[PDB]
RNA sequence: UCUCUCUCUCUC
RNA sequence: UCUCUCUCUCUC
RNA sequence: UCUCUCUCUCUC
């Protein structure tokens, strides 16, 4: 059944929206002030800090960073008769914790929290990619397209586990491997137990994310090493390099800024009644009638800023430029020639140069974001029955496709990773960059509500460049 | 997190400084005497001898060199009413070992020891380059710029492993190869095991230091030889010759003399509270308000001595003269016309000719010393994505950059070193001596604390000579 | 080398 | 990820 | 699945 999940997501988004309304009430902000991305970012990171129990518990035992008992940050921006001002106002954790407490009818709202962490992951992935950590681990910065949800902490649950990508998991595993190489953390203490439990859980998440059998079995053989040394390091690097083409269907949750949700909730559009979806038309239908303001530097182009924020909202920073432009309706500028900077504003930059303006979010078309992979993998490995069932009682043979039956079982168990690298490189060679994917699907029009008739895109515009980076 | 490392380095430097204060207390030296480079050198080499367990353990079984149970050296210089005197005072190992024992709150202070070895490496590299060992190994003395940390012993840890350079590792590997050629040390005894363990660890350090993939794979194929004969000898020589241009980002730790640290600690500038950094502005900000005295021969120019000691402190002996002068503010004299000698003073030279004077260390500007390489390598091999991730569930192809996918994996494994020498010489030909490096970075002013605005240097002063040697 | 291996971000 | 990993079905 | 999982029988 899908009605229950729809009601649950509608309920928790209604809670988030009415929390945002409560914030707009308590901050004494004007109508325009509540349509700002920056203040939503500030309050939302404040919520992240308040609800992150582990960092807090690390902090009350560590009274450092000067003024840090329980209050952090808070750069609220207010419009003064056309000009702008920034104030560093500090808020307690317990008060706003309880404001959430009645902002969700007595619940913890963990799903909402995961929504905020995921929307932060999308903003960071859209703005800045961490080539720095990649090169730190020795890992090639050519594969930044594997950095989905890198800024996410491990505190996120299964819903948060859905969005964090393959390459980010390679990075976090490499971090723990380097730590275990530096010192003997693998002893029989409770620390070793929690490390191996986390390691096996993360490997299970990995094997869930992949699609082809060969990579799944190689990963299953990865955690056989009770004492991970150096071989699994290049094993995981090659895992990422092979997942370049055999990508895992991780997630692309379409999280939206708190201002848009709050404006919708304030207008009386209760999400529980008509339902809410995070994947279909629904996150789209709020945006063509949404007004968003933000601050811009006197050199930044607002036209680029609108495209970038729509990227971040729809987590399309790692999507191809051609289809993103087709859905948007206008050409999208790659990261190479963007005359803009990060949407976050520095704490030291001067107050005079900021100017507020409206953000354009309307898009001509819409499409469903499925958590799947390209059809090319199913082209490499076709589909069909392998077994048969006797319906009539007739004296006949039972046809069994035996050579694939051994392949599923792997009768002769794989010796090491290398034998798997062999046929996975063979599959990579079988791959082609002209393999059309997602057959039977298309882009629909905004007037469509039940996905009745799509239109297939056709891109013949030479080599404009399907690479947002470079 | 960077606060913990900052606190740790501040703590161990505070320990070193208060050890230096304890030494100034116990030596009964005057105020000027503690501002001398020579006495700091003597006590510091004494500490090196006391804390070097391997040489000690080689020595108590070898009672040679006459008076050598546990006491070595100690040429302390004292000012007598304007004149100078030198005394050979001998100190025990255990007493000063325990003085360190409470000089660091009960710790071994291995990081501090590594700091002293690295600062010795910088002094030796600044003063004298070992062309002698290069020619001994048959290795061309044109490449002395690869002699970073040559005097370092193998006892230094990972922090010490960071600073010892590529050419020095070529030299130590050549030494072990010559030893294994002379006699069959590669037998199945425990000695062979420790040799191969050290050899593979040092090769791992090498492959960590390099940047380009081709050299890394060639090095990975280097240790495939279970019995190293003669081919890997020219293989490593060519490795150094290729690393001439494709240099490895080894390290340039800015270690400072114990007198400067001790003066700062005595004044009450506790490093733990405000933090310490070895790489940023911090090692610089102590020096413009630091007073240093040293002995000089009646022919040596003190102006050259100040520049040389600032070179040694900042380990800029292998940096280009133009930028070093720009940061210093005054022209730097190359090794060709330096009317000075080594900062260490001979044990046989007469007492009458020594004269003490102040050392100039103040510099107009400051810059960050990153452990990176020139941008020219990234110009030869550009940057960008290689793989893509499906965000929307659309029937579409997954574009994979296959020809580089084989290149990362090396599907057809390299036959020997020669096929790699081919394209590495091709890359050397692609190299140009006009490739501007370190884009997006610059030199900042001393008034800057957060690296807000740099100024890019522009050198058009013909051919003054960017070669400290020759 | 988490005081910056490149596309730039105060954000640890 | 039950708003679609492929053969297409409004059927939850 | 008593309209036949093997040695064959209309026998219920």
Numbering used by the authors:
A (entry chain A), B (entry chain A): 21 to 490
Paper text:
Influenza virus genome encapsidation is essential for the formation of a helical viral ribonucleoprotein (vRNP) complex composed of nucleoproteins (NP), the trimeric polymerase, and the viral genome. Within each vRNP, the viral RNA (vRNA) segment is encapsidated by the viral nucleoprotein (NP) and attached to the heterotrimeric RNA-dependent RNA polymerase. In this study, we established a biological tool, the RNP-like particles assembled from recombinant influenza A virus NP and synthetic RNA, and we present the first subnanometric cryo–electron microscopy structure of the helical NP-RNA complex (8.7 to 5.3 Å).
Each asymmetric unit (NP monomer) is related by a rise of 24.3 Å and a twist of 57.4°, resulting in a right-handed parallel double-stranded helical reconstruction with approximately 6.3-NP protomers per helix turn. Combined with the AFM data, these results confirm that our RNP-like particles are assembled as a right-handed helix. We were able to visualize a parallel double-stranded helical assembly at a resolution sufficiently high to describe the conformational changes of NP to accommodate RNA binding and oligomerization into nucleocapsid. It is important to point out that our helical reconstruction is straight and does not fully reflect the highly flexible nature and the inherent dynamic of our ribonucleoprotein-like particles and so the vRNP. The RNP-like structure resembles the compacted state of vRNP; however, because of the parallel helical assembly, this structure can only provide meaningful information regarding the intra-strand interactions such as the NP-NP oligomerization, NP-RNA interaction, and overall architecture along one strand. We did not observe interstrand interactions that would be relevant for vRNP coherence. To propose a picture even closer to that of a vRNP, we generated the antiparallel RNP-like conformation by flipping one strand by 180° around an axis perpendicular to the helical axis without any steric clashes.
